[PDB]
Amino acid sequence: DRTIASSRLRLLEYSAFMEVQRDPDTYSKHLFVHIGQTNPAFSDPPLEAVDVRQIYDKFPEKKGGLKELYEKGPPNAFFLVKFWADLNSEGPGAFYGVSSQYSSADSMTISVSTKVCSFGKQVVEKVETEYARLENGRFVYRIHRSPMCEYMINFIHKLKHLPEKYMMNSVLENFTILQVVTSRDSQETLLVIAFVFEVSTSEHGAQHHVYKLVKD
Numbered sequence: 001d002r003t004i005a006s007s008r009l010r011l012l013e014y015s016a017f018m019e020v021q022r023d024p025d026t027y028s029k030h031l032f033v034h035i036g037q038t039n040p041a042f043s044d045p046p047l048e049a050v051d052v053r054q055i056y057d058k059f060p061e062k063k064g065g066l067k068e069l070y071e072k073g074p075p076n077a078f079f080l081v082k083f084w085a086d087l088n089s090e091g092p093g094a095f096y097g098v099s100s101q102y103s104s105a106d107s108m109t110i111s112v113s114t115k116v117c118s119f120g121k122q123v124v125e126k127v128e129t130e131y132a133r134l135e136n137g138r139f140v141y142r143i144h145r146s147p148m149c150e151y152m153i154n155f156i157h158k159l160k161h162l163p164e165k166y167m168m169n170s171v172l173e174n175f176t177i178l179q180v181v182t183s184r185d186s187q188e189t190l191l192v193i194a195f196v197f198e199v200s201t202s203e204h205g206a207q208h209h210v211y212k213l214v215k216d
């Protein structure tokens with residue numbers, strides 16, 4: 001279906017942004033990485049596969065770690081997403097947030113873990129609980145303007161400081177984010193997304209690419 005979905009849950013949209021208030025009337029918002037709600041086109045080809053074994057070490061090993069999650073399954077829930085971040089956006093106290101939306105055929109309470117990882121070691125984990133709302137023959141879950149942690153704020157600023165993009169990509173090669181969305185009381189896994197990043201060498205802006213994770 002070329003979507004980031006598992007039978008239990010679907011990630012409709014994902015956004016990481018900075019917002020600034022130019023004047024009291026006007027606010028400017030720049031998106032670092034963006035995934036939008038797109039309709040599946042009949043024409044579209046299947047998602048390519050990446051052997052999960054090959055990305056194990058980019059994420060912590062023991063627990064909350066790909067190998068273990070993937071053994072727990074369900075293996076249809078596991079995806080990989082490659083962002084090309086737009087790093088061309090400033091002042092003190094602009095707001096840094098992450099805004100996402102999910103859809104389901106059921107109503108649950110979902111818990112969203114987000115581990116920022118460096119060199120496969122996790123530097124921080126957020127945990128968010130989100131509740132179901134009903135629309136369109138589906139239940140949706142909205143996460144509005146969730147704050148960015150400061151690690152990531154410092155990382156983005158200092159990463160933008162670097163003189164050349166190829167350096168940025170050198171730093172990014174051991175930067176990952178692992179996101180696991182569970183049902184809160186079940187702790188059943190609904191959706192796991194591994195995230196890897198590259199700086200957009202084009203001025204084309206934010207791009208992404210989705211691959212299914214497999215264990216042949």
Ligand SMILES: C[C@H](NC(=O)N1CCc2c(cccc2-c2ccc(C(F)(F)F)cc2)C1)c1ccccc1
Binds near residue numbers: 033098116147195
């Ligand atoms: C709730 C909050 N979520 C986050 O902080 N984040 C971080 C930033 C981020 C996220 C998702 C996708 C992409 C990015 C991102 C990464 C890199 C770059 C670039 F351009 F710099 F490479 C640009 C955008 C989610 C959180 C709080 C505490 C602990 C962990 C998480």
